[PDB]
Amino acid sequence: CGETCVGGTCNTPGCTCSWPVCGHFRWGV
């Protein structure tokens, strides 16, 4: 998605948290 969940919170509809950053595991956005 192009974000960062340094706090550990990125549970969005269609996106996952990837501390420090945020997005996915394959792409990372």
Query: In the chain, where do the E strands start and end?
Result: 16-18, 21-23
Give the bridge partners for 17, in sequence order.
22
Tell me if 21 sits within 8 A of 28, measured CB to CB: yes
Question: What residues have CB less than 8 Å from 21, skipping those under 6 apart?
Answer: 3, 4, 5, 28
Which residues is 16 bridged to in the sheet? 23
Tell me the residue length of the chain.
29
Residue 24: phi and psi, rounded to 5, are -140, -170
- Per DSSP, 13 falls in state T
Cα 18 to chain centroid, rounded: 4
Q: Which residues on adjacent β-strands are paired with residue 23?
A: 16
Helix, strand or coil, per DSSP, at residue 23: strand
